[PDB]
């Protein structure tokens, strides 16, 4: 996260760290959506241009964390994966369209002050909140510039689709949305390397619950002027999510 700030304790109790078992390291972000299911970017698990193809056994899920590097005894919980599901139309060759994956945990995780699932949007929540200028929040342990001690937070405004499309030569799809400040707006911030798979969340003003509207997917560089962060549109892929869970 570039140009964010340190999270408060318990501010993002759905934040999940995808952890590599050997060499022990951060792979990606992710989010908790129930006591047994974790949501992330498909590119976190499968990205052939970089010879990435992780299997269940290569990885661990670390839930309830704050510190990037420390073992947070009596607070985090470390879970093994039972199974990985990648969208069958995930487009790694072109533009990362449908950049989404689910992870089923071996055992349900215990909820706590620091561990709690986020909501997934229904159609009406999506329509209400996914509007240009409306701000969301993205969190991660990724790079601070194109390594944090603790989880970082940044609030960013949703950008108009033509502004998103005109910022890149990549083909943008209805399964993506972009966010970030324009150079003229003065403020800045973005996701970066290692923040992949983490959540873009919004707080509904109607029922006061947090919803995960996006997944950290791609950006040309990090926090570059005139470029934006691109996020997987979670509601657009909700049919696939539910079918998998069901």
């Amino acid at each position: 996260i570039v140009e964010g700030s340190d999270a408060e304790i318990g501010m993002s109790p759905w934040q999940v760290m995808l952890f590599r078992k050997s060499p022990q390291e951060l792979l990606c972000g992710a989010s908790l959506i129930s006591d047994r299911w974790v949501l992330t970017a498909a590119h976190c698990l499968l990205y052939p241009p970089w010879d990435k193809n992780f299997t269940e056994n290569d990885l661990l899920v670390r839930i309830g964390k704050h510190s990037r590097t420390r073992y947070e005894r009596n607070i985090e919980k470390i879970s093994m994966l039972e199974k990985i599901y990648i969208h069958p139309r995930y487009n790694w060759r072109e533009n990362l369209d449908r950049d989404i994956a689910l992870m089923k945990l071996k055992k349900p995780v215990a909820f706590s002050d620091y561990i709690h699932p986020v909501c997934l949007p229904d159609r009406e929540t999506a329509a209400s909140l996914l509007q240009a200028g409306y701000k969301g929040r993205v969190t991660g342990w990724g790079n601070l510039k194109e390594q944090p001690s603790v989880l970082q937070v940044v609030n960013l405004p949703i950008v108009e689709r033509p502004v998103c499309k005109d910022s890149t030569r990549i083909r943008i799809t209805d399964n993506m949305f972009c966010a970030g400040y324009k150079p003229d707006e003065g403020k800045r911030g973005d996701a970066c390397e290692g923040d992949s798979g983490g959540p873009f969340v919004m707080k509904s003003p109607f029922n006061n619950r947090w919803y995960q509207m996006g997944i950290v997917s791609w950006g040309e560089g990090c926090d570059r002027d005139g470029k934006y962060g691109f996020y997987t549109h979670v509601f657009r892929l909700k049919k696939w999510i539910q079918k998998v869970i069901d």
């Binding site: 060499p23 022990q24 390291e25 951060l26 661990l60 590097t69 420390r70 073992y71 470390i78 093994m80 390594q147």
Partner: peptide
């Protein structure tokens, strides 16, 4: 690596 060691159990 820069990562404090996790319990062996995991």
């Amino acid at each position: 690596g820069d990562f404090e060691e996790i319990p062996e159990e995991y």
